[PDB]
Amino acid sequence: PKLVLDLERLATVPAEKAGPLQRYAATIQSQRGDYNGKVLSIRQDDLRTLAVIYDQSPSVLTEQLISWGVLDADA
Amino acid sequence: PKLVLDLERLATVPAEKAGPLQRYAATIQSQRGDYNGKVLSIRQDDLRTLAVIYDQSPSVLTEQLISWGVLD
Ligand SMILES: Nc1nc2c(ncn2[C@@H]2O[C@@H]3COP(=O)(O)O[C@H]4[C@@H](O)[C@H](n5cnc6c(=O)[nH]c(N)nc65)O[C@@H]4COP(=O)(O)O[C@H]3[C@H]2O)c(=O)[nH]1
Ligand SMILES: Nc1nc2c(ncn2[C@@H]2O[C@@H]3COP(=O)(O)O[C@H]4[C@@H](O)[C@H](n5cnc6c(=O)[nH]c(N)nc65)O[C@@H]4COP(=O)(O)O[C@H]3[C@H]2O)c(=O)[nH]1
Ligand SMILES: Nc1nc2c(ncn2[C@@H]2O[C@@H]3COP(=O)(O)O[C@H]4[C@@H](O)[C@H](n5cnc6c(=O)[nH]c(N)nc65)O[C@@H]4COP(=O)(O)O[C@H]3[C@H]2O)c(=O)[nH]1
Ligand SMILES: Nc1nc2c(ncn2[C@@H]2O[C@@H]3COP(=O)(O)O[C@H]4[C@@H](O)[C@H](n5cnc6c(=O)[nH]c(N)nc65)O[C@@H]4COP(=O)(O)O[C@H]3[C@H]2O)c(=O)[nH]1
């Protein structure tokens, strides 16, 4: 399963919920110099680190991102 | 030193030296379905994967990769 984020839906999720995801995605973009600004695919191991940053299980985290329509239901 | 590979350069490299790396390249491109240019950039840690498959030190591998013109 692929992990693809919607950069445009993400930007409008309030910081209180999405702040740490937004900052994480920004550090990847800066490192990449990847500023397409529509979509961002991350490594499957980036999910474990986000889950730690969010303090949830990778599983709980995924379902939340999907619930926001940021992460394609494919994952 | 970032691993940006010139696939067009490496093709012209004789098979008994370029082979493993050509075949490694091709596996990565198949993993990503990345078939849109003559350049392949790979992970810095892949250097070790490669030094293992070639059974040479990273140092060695990296320096003949530059003579070959495959790397910058
Ligand atoms: N800028 C960007 N676009 C994304 C991202 N995720 C998905 N896409 C879009 O979705 C397709 C597949 O992305 P992919 O799984 O990364 O799979 C990609 C990726 O593996 C690779 N690829 C394409 N361009 C580049 C590149 O500039 N650098 C690297 N390192 N790989 C690339 O080729 C595969 C197919 O690329 P395409 O089908 O032509 O086009 C893309 C691209 O239009 C992302 O994080 N950033
Ligand atoms: N060792 C190695 N393995 C490789 C390489 N390229 C691809 N793979 C493997 O193939 C999977 C799919 O690559 P992808 O479609 O480009 O899909 C990639 C891709 O769109 C993007 N991605 C991950 N890392 C990078 C990166 O450093 N740069 C860019 N531009 N995109 C990345 O995140 C997606 C998921 O990444 P993964 O879960 O890791 O899943 C990756 C990874 O297991 C490589 O150069 N070296
Ligand atoms: N996961 C993913 N990431 C993407 C995709 N398209 C672009 N990117 C990201 O966006 C950066 C800039 O892409 P670019 O300058 O348009 O243009 C790229 C591209 O023209 C070319 N390039 C270098 N390496 C590769 C490669 O392995 N595959 C491909 N298809 N192009 C590459 O050099 C420039 C910089 O390459 P990068 O260092 O890889 O840096 C890429 C990469 O991090 C994509 O479809 N999927
Ligand atoms: N399509 C595709 N290309 C891949 C993948 N892995 C590596 N690459 C390519 O190989 C490059 C160097 O990978 P790196 O040493 O891991 O160096 C990477 C890595 O340290 C980091 N980075 C980029 N994207 C991601 C990511 O999604 N997750 C993580 N944890 N680190 C990333 O920033 C670096 C520079 O990224 P780039 O400019 O994009 O340059 C990337 C990219 O062109 C992959 O799974 N799929």
Author numbering:
A (entry chain A): 83 to 157
B (entry chain R): 83 to 154
Give sentences from the paper.
Here, we report that c-di-GMP can assemble into a tetramer that mediates the effective dimerization of a transcription factor, BldD, which controls the progression of multicellular differentiation in sporulating actinomycete bacteria. BldD is an 18 kDa DNA-binding protein consisting of two distinct domains connected by a flexible linker. BldD sits at the top of the regulatory cascade controlling development, serving to repress expression of sporulation genes during vegetative growth (den Hengst et al., 2010). Specifically, structural and biochemical analyses show that the second messenger c-di-GMP activates BldD DNA binding by driving a unique form of dimerization that is mediated by a tetrameric form of c-di-GMP.
To elucidate the molecular basis for c-di-GMP recognition and binding by the BldD CTD and to gain insight into how this interaction may elicit developmental signaling, we determined structures of the S. venezuelae BldD CTD (residues 80–166) and S. coelicolor BldD CTD (residues 80–167) in complex with c-di-GMP. Three S. venezuelae BldD C-domain-(c-di-GMP) structures and one S. coelicolor BldD C-domain-(c-di-GMP) structure were determined to resolutions of 1.95 Å, 2.33 Å, 1.75 Å, and 2.25 Å, respectively (see Extended Experimental Procedures and Tables S1 and S2). Further, BldD from S. coelicolor and S. venezuelae contain an identical DBD and differ by only two residues in the DBD-CTD linker and five residues in the CTD, suggesting that BldD function is broadly conserved between the two species. The BldD CTD uses a previously unseen mode of c-di-GMP binding in which two noninteracting CTDs are glued together by a c-di-GMP tetramer composed of two interlocked c-di-GMP dimers. The BldD CTD interacts with c-di-GMP using two contiguous surface motifs, herein called motif 1 and motif 2, which are located between the two β-α-α repeats. Motif 1 is composed of residues 114–116 (RGD) and motif 2 is composed of residues 125–128 (RQDD). The combined motifs from two CTD subunits provide ideal shape and electrostatic complementarity for encasing the unusual cage-like c-di-GMP tetramer. Further, mutagenesis of either BldD motif 1 or motif 2 abolishes c-di-GMP binding in DRaCALA assays, confirming that, unlike I-site c-di-GMP binding, both motifs 1 and 2 in BldD are required to construct the complete binding site for the tetrameric c-di-GMP complex. Overall, these data demonstrate unequivocally that c-di-GMP binds the CTD with a stoichiometry of four c-di-GMP molecules per CTD dimer, concordant with our structures. Notably, the identical CTD dimer-(c-di-GMP) tetramer structure was seen in multiple crystal forms.
